[PDB]
Amino acid sequence: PVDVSVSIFINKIYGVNTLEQTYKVDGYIVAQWTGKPRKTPGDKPLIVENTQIERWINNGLWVPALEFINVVGSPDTGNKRLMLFPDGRVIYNARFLGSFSNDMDFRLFPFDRQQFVLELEPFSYNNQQLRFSDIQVYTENIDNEEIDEWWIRGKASTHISDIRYDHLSSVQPNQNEFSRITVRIDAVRNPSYYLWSFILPLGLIIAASWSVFWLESFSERLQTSFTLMLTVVAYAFYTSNILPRLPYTTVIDQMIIAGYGSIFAAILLIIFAHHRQANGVEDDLLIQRCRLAFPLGFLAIGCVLVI
Template sequence: MKFPKSILCIFILFVSVQLFARQHHTISTEKEPLEVSVNLRINKIYNINSVQETYQIDGYFMYTWKNEEAISYLKDSTANSIVFENDKARELINSDLWIPAFELINVQGSREVPNIRIEIYSDGIIEYEERFFATCSTNMDFKKFPFDSQVYQVAIEAFSYGSKKIVFTNPKLFLEKDHEDYLGEDWEFVNSDAHVVTKTYKYMDDSINSEKNSYSRVIFEIKAQRLSGYYEWQVLFPLLIIILASFSIFWIKEFGSQIGVGFTLMLTVVAFNFYSASILPKLPYNTFIEYVIIVGYIFIFLGIVAVIINHRINGEEDKGDKIPLLKYFRYLFPIVYALIMIVLYMSLIV
């Protein structure tokens, strides 16, 4: 018995479509998007680089979703679940079973994934876990440096599927109990947060409202406060002493010594400015420590100008008709400087 050619062609086309769908790991075309829960456990945040605004993370990702097609992998097993690790897990990813790819958005370069694990449960639940090492970046705010706090972020999206296909739900962030272990000696843990947002791109499709432009994103955040003790004692305190020492020129009688002391202390403040520039990126705004240095520049410069004016008016000879400018400056400069520094420190509270 011979089959009509039309029926044979339809059969071949049907089989080809099925094979193509399996080969390309198709996702369900149901109206409701696939819900994927994601957990992040951080072992350590280290090599925090303020100049490059980067930090390295050692942690674990765990993604969980349901795919009833995965039940077939347990049909010959009496166990409640089956586990695939490393090479076996990678073979499973390259097989017919659909497993989505997830992208670390704020990573620099590529992340290192030494170990992965996939566990399939008898009810179709799939758990995908990976150990990773990554260098991440985020925009840091140094306006209050060295009394600043920073938020270290880890952002995750599905690589190929928008929010109409995959949405993240119930993100959880787990941290070690001893926060000093993963933040190092320079930072103190403040709080943490995990939330889901919808990221809209403008270049994936010409139509702004296209589903290709909308992606579900999970953002994990860890807020930490910089421990400022080092900068207080090694930078700010010596700088304060230098500025106060500059007011001594109003107590010196010889004009040459006054100028010499003023310019020497000015050069010392310049050295502090070079140091602050070496530990921070090039910023479009001034930090707290830079404002302190700028104020120091201004007062030393004004002190030099003040003794020059006094010398031009009164000279160095003792005269009865002298205007006691230096006596006024001895108290005026420290008082004004103290008021300005109070205002600067009050700005840290705002």
């Protein structure tokens, strides 16, 4: 087995796609291994760039294809370099920009943690193995964080391992184990924007919705909630058109549903007060004064949103 050492430099992690559960990574990859020594011009190592690499491979230079197990589509690679040493060893250097996949849970929306992952594994060779993995994620931990969308809690953690494929080729003696590098980078979302521009106003609006009980008339109390209704709908619109699309409800999504319910419960009470009596217009003076039953009956149902 050939010992291949891998170094991965990560430049930029961006463009998360919530629906597809993908994210974009720009970086370099470096692979080193040793082959039989060679005569290089002078005795300085030889440099082979881009189009020329192909030529050396035709004359039988071994350059194993390393696959990103979890790229969606084939990465855009920039410059490629072979550094051929006279003492045999070989260094492959290439820049890449790729879309990568991972299981991503967005349920705690505005405050969710996520992990960006790279998985490197040789495409054709079970033989030849990964010596060691190094991830130079030379961004910076707690710096421009508030200028950037995601806060990195790395550095990156690595993990070389062996993957067994059951249903393999017609090869069987013992060629079903491939060497796999797995990089993980942890991150949390920058919850600021969503608190101040979504959670907050949603609160104010839901709260204000409660001030319907301090209206004198019944005709006032009822007609007004039809406007609070329209308000939550507009806010749902605004909220859902700007927030990331998902197949499940988020924190915010539930708040909105709550607002919908609070306002509908009120309409039930408001109408009940007016007809649970012993006359015609005896609004249960006590009930129509649940101007406290709601606010904290909602901050009770609102502390079971987090049970």
